[PDB]
Amino acid sequence: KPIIPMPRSRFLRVKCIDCGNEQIVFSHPATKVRCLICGATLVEPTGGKGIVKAKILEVLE
């Protein structure tokens, strides 16, 4: 148990498969991550981390 509580969740800078939309997403989403343009699902909110479906570009703290 640390003195200070850090957040385990990260953020992900992600490039979409279809329309090549670049987005920032939460590592533990609660709803289905819909792209802005094509609207396809990107991350699936599961019990733990969301199941990313696009291609990660870079993690963010």
Partner: protein, 155 residues
């Protein structure tokens, strides 16, 4: 989560000790207000608005942004709704309990013999009454305002 169940489970969550907004964010303070009002005019509450902002738009917290209209107050989604005639007169948190109480009351009307649900009602109305008393202390609610089930049906 111990007021009634007295169970010490901690499904809470952790925020980083961040004072300044993250560098990697691209949206300026003006765009977040536009996004939240767009979501709110659809009919989303501040909690789910925030979940969507952090989920898809990827913003950690609006509270990390400082109010352009006030140097000494952190910007909150509720404050943004208030800034444009969208904040609710009844705060969301109590409104949700009101509607839950009403629907449960219908269920009890249809099912007089479920005493477990009777006790559930007995505690959730104590929650409603406690928050009503708090708001009377704080003043966000009218002094004469008093929850009544028949009036709650209207709400």
């Amino acid at each position: 989560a111990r007021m009634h169940a007295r169970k010490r489970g901690k499904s809470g969550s952790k925020r980083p000790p961040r004072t300044a907004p993250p560098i990697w964010v691209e949206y300026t303070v003006e765009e977040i207000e536009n996004l939240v009002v767009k979501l709110r005019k659809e009919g989303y509450s501040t909690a789910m608005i925030g979940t969507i902002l952090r989920d898809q738009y990827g913003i950690p917290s609006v509270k990390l942004f400082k109010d352009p209209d006030n140097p000494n107050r952190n910007l909150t989604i509720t404050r943004i709704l208030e800034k444009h005639g969208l904040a609710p007169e009844i705060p969301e948190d109590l409104m949700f309990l009101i509607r839950r109480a009403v629907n449960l009351r219908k269920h009890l009307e249809q099912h007089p013999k479920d005493l477990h649900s009777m006790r559930g009602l007995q505690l959730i109305e104590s929650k409603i009454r406690r928050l009503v008393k708090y708001y009377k202390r704080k003043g966000k609610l009218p002094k004469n305002w008093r929850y009544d089930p028949e009036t709650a049906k209207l709400l």
